[PDB]
Structure 1
């Protein structure tokens, strides 16, 4: 009889269904139209609830949680620009594969296109960026509950990767005490309510077959390229490449231990490239490669075949090589394509890699961001995880540091946005419960500045280094025009982050040399809280150091 009651019974089915597909975390932003979803979610004991006031950060908080847990994560927002704010994290998820189930409340059809407040056209709003899109009908008992639960079971069950938009219209009244309205409608599901399985099980797997001619190809002069992958896959890939006796180019996102470090430097040396030309096959595991010299070498190399192995779908080779695009879990694939011990065929490149790291060590002392990146190993929290921000820092660490094999690295290198790094870091911390080191640039920190609110709640110490070089100094690294560079590229904002931390009652340090930095760290890892460490450095020193080291190493 009661529209409010059935609304909540309708919503309760939606949320309960999600529990059958491993949704545990649910991220909620405030609103009224979302009431049926939010109350069913708050009443449901399967969920861990997170809240935030900024829906774009809420998006990234969900992204962070899914990134580390590898589980689908649900988000509830109200109708309007709240929905639109989810787009960036949704777009990121579409590239790197996190399962964001967006439950977006909506006005009913009778309140669309009539000037009603906070009513917009929401179905189809994210275009092709979600993997599945569900535009739910207006709630009515004339549609069976088994339909609703089947619709959701289809979307989640077949979800290989990426986000799901579930548009959820509710008509007022939204409030009022609960009736029996919708109860017998709900009871039509029988003991599904006490079950732990989906109502409809549809879960086909998408996987490439084993490559039958691998034993042929593993005999050739090959190269292994390791992009983004799990910490455990990084260790397996490193051992695999070593046994193959193939050189391993390890991205900072690979956690391979980068046995040939500073590839971004030695790859600029013609001797290394001359040697790499003897390669008949390149086997790349993972993607979203970081460094410019590697992306240039990828683009320029011409093996007989180029293979890319990864569990996300689609083309991943921006150079469009003749070859194979193999969809698989990287660890599973390695077992299906095992290595057999063979003599290494590379002689020059190991020597160049050693000299390159040596050249960087010669310059380790200056109190700069390049040097910070270089030493970032000395500061990783024990049994923790690293979140690398975008722009220069990931590039500097990629080129200058040799990160430990199997030490977990996380990032937003799908679209490489600087818009959700603090809140994403917060979700990355909360999902694993591990001590976390996060490093971002100053424009990035400002962009998601209000996520400092989220970092007031962490389950383990989280150190946030904000590298302040007064602008987006990547545009000092790029050959930008000097006359327009500052105003239209760098965009220095001339701030510090002391008041930013103080506002949110977060410990803050502004270390002026290495001893103070080490002191700040020792202080920061002591408690389950976020410490902001602001490192003030000169604008272009980082960019100039990288360039100089590139030139030096090119002449070895």
Structure 2
């Protein structure tokens, strides 16, 4: 009868089901309405909790932790504008297919839409950016209601985790009193037995008729793989193996894993962004079959090349039917597991069909472009942005995670990160390509991969400085390389940089913050790199420090276009006279 007991039984059934369905970490924000749910998550012995007071930074922290661990992560906040702060992470979880279980407390029906304090319409709050929305019942400890609480915990994880993965949103109207009964413990097998809903491991498969068609239309064709941002693990070697058994180049995004899976290989192309610009070379590269994996790669020239390819079989491997194809060039859509596709083609495609002139065409351009790029970077003392990427490529340990901010860092890794023989798990928020939350994302990922590193421009670092409070609070290890060009450097390349009247105020926002002060605020070892060996020293000192390190490299925004154009011409001119 006690409302506190009814409140306890209800939430205990929901949270226990969540944990047993695979949720191991809950990112909680402080509130009064969320009191019963947050207290019960604490009383769980198996669930790990991270408290973050900024609801925006909390969301991207769950985002990155779920990105890196591949497991479901619970967010929990109070009612009011707190839930609204989750919206940027939710939008990026949706586009980037991350399983977040968004729990938001709310006022009960009597305090809804009546002008009550700290109460807003939380119904369908995130719209189409969640896979499912549920407005839970007011707590009841009835038999059917305890089974309904458990039923929803199982449902929520399963939908979040089901291909294509994405965020899920449960709203909890909660009436006062809000203090549950934590003694005796609501869990710990201290009474009733749970009824966990086991979900079985299922995956999509190509039909045997479709397998034979796929194999037939791809035999002996001059083919090309395009692997953009991918996530499904252990697909690096199988892809390389199938590429070698056909004689096909893989144009590989940095976020594919292929530029850093632990070995060197000939099929991976990492300088396509460099040479797909030169028209006099494009004629010898024309394919007959493209097979895209994962998301669209970062490279704009590659996109414009794929766009203008006529008379071609353009396969797109989209498990879960997300229809991510911004050039709208698809000719054959394959709705099945990527693991399965690589495997049934490895065992069915002919090993004999190999035009060696085809792969030799691609690899030649690449090996030459790659070493002209590594040359100009090896013979420079100016710590320009290309050099930073170069030097991080050399200095990073094996088994090291690298989070990359959007804007210019993500593009420079494309140009200046050729393939290395280290396993370097690479992460980037590439759903909406937002500069918000990259600090909090890299922090959550640092829960999973260590050593963790973050390359990030200055504006994005300011945008999410509050994430660093988590590093201070939880004693996390992250090594942030801030490329401080004082503004938005990416805008110097776009055509708005010609007219200087309204520039700088708009694009390229001079900020003039001494990030030394921000590092003392969050108790971070701060280093400023001026030379090449200055940076070497810092990465080195950062390897002994189990904690937050921040390494600033001041660069000039207005020279970046010149160095990039000068280098691309050296690659274009070389490749232009290469037959």
Q: TM-score, normalised by structure 2?
A: 0.89
Per-residue deviation at 1:375? 3.4
Asked if structure 2 preserves the Cα contact closer than 8 Å seen for 1:390 and 1:417, the reply is yes
Identify the residue that residue 385 of structure 1 maps to in structure 2: 401
* 8 Å CA contact retained: 2:525, 2:548: yes
Structure 1 window deviating more from structure 2 (414-423 vs 537-546): it is: 537-546
Q: Secondary structure at the match of 2:369?
A: helix
- The one of 255, 275, 280 equivalent to 1:266 is 275
Q: Are 2:180 and 1:167 aligned?
A: no
The answer to whether structure 1 residue 369 and structure 2 residue 370 are counterparts is no
- 1:176 is displaced (CA, Å) by 6.8
Q: Please state how far the C-alpha of 1:457 moved relative to its aligned partner.
A: 5.8
Q: Secondary structure at the match of 2:334?
A: strand
Q: Relative to 1, partners in 2 of residues 1:351 and 1:403: Cα closer, same or farther, differing over 3 Å?
A: closer
Deviations 1:433-491 (Å, cap 9, x if unpaired)? x1011100000000001111122367774210011001011011111143222101111
Contact 2:8-2:181 within 8 A present in 1 as well: no
The answer for unaligned runs of 5 or more in structure 1 is none
Higher mean C-alpha displacement, 469-478 vs 295-304: 295-304
Q: Is the 8 A contact 1:14 1:149 kept in 2?
A: yes
| Separation (CA, whole Å) in 2 of partners of 1:435 and 1:270 | 41
The answer to whether 1:296 aligns with 2:300 is no
Residue by residue over 1:16-55, the C-alpha shift from the partner in whole angstroms, topping out at 9 and shown as x without a partner, is 1111211101111111100111111101112111111111
Distance 1:6 1:531 in 2: 47
Corresponding residue to 1:491 among 505, 509, 516? 509
| Structure 1 residue 508: Cα displacement | 0.6
CA contact (8 A) 1:4 1:172 kept: no
Do residues 79 (structure 1) and 79 (structure 2) align? yes
Aligned: 1:522 with 2:522: no
Q: 1:420 aligns with which of 437, 440, 443?
A: 437
Alignment partner, residue 145 of structure 1: 146
1:131-175 alpha-carbon deviations (Å, 9 max, x no partner): 111111222345521122113322322432101100011001113
Deviates more, 1:16-25 or 1:534-543: 534-543
CA contact under 8 A between 1:462 and 1:525: conserved in structure 2? no
1:48 aligns with 2:70: no
Once residues 81 and 267 of structure 1 are traced to their aligned partners in structure 2, the CA distance between those partners, rounded to angstroms, is 46
Indicate conservation of the 8 Å contact 1:288/1:413, yes or no: no
TM-aligned CA distance change 1:115 to 1:260, over 3 Å: same
The correspondence for 2:561, drawn from 538, 543, 549, is 543
Q: Cα offset for 1:310?
A: 4.3
Partner of 1:355: 368
Decide whether aligned partners of structure 1 residues 78 and 370 sit closer, same or farther in structure 2, where only a CA change above 3 A counts: same
Given that 2:59 and 2:90 are in contact with CA atoms closer than 8 Å, whether structure 1 keeps it comes out as: yes
**What residue is the counterpart of 1:314 in the other structure?**
322
CA 1:222–1:553: 2 relative to 1, 3 Å: same
Q: Which runs of 5+ in 2 are unaligned?
A: 260-266
State the distance in 2 between where 1:259 and 1:12 align.
Answer: 50
Query: Is the CA contact (8 Å cut-off) linking 2:401 and 2:453 kept in structure 1?
Result: yes
Q: Deviations over 1:272-316 (max 9, x none)?
A: 421232x11101122131111111112222353111224454112
Query: Structure 2: how far apart are the matches of 1:411 and 1:269?
Result: 28
C-alpha deviation, 1:349, in angstroms: 3.0
Q: What is the CA distance between 1:128 and its match in structure 2? A: 0.7
Question: Is 2:409–2:457's contact at 8 Å kept on the other side of the alignment?
Answer: yes
Q: Name 1:20's counterpart in structure 2.
A: 20
Quickly say closer, same or farther: Cα 1:173–1:513, change in 2 above 3 A.
same
- Secondary structure in 2 aligned to 1:10? helix
Counterparts of 2:507 and 2:221 in 1: how far apart (Å)?
A: 46
Aligned residue pairs: how many? 546
Equivalent residues in 2 for 1:120-519, closer than 5 Å: 120-142=120-142, 144-159=145-160, 160=162, 161-175=165-179, 191=193, 193=194, 197-198=196-197, 201=199, 205=203, 209=207, 211-216=211-216, 217-230=218-231, 232-257=234-259, 259-277=268-286, 279-311=287-319, 313-338=321-346, 340-341=350-351, 342-344=354-356, 345-364=358-377, 365=380, 366-404=382-420, 406-432=423-449, 434-456=450-472, 461-480=477-496, 481-519=499-537
Q: Given the two structures, how large is their TM-score scaled by the length of structure 1?
A: 0.92
Deviation, structure 1 residue 179:
9.3
Please say if 1:553 is aligned against 2:571.
yes
Q: Alpha-carbon deviation of 1:492? A: 1.3
- Paired residue secondary structure (2:128): coil
Rounded to whole Å, the distance in 1 between the matches of 2:367 and 2:202 is: 47
Deviations along 1:84-105, one digit per CA (max 9) or x if unpaired, are: 1111111111111110001110
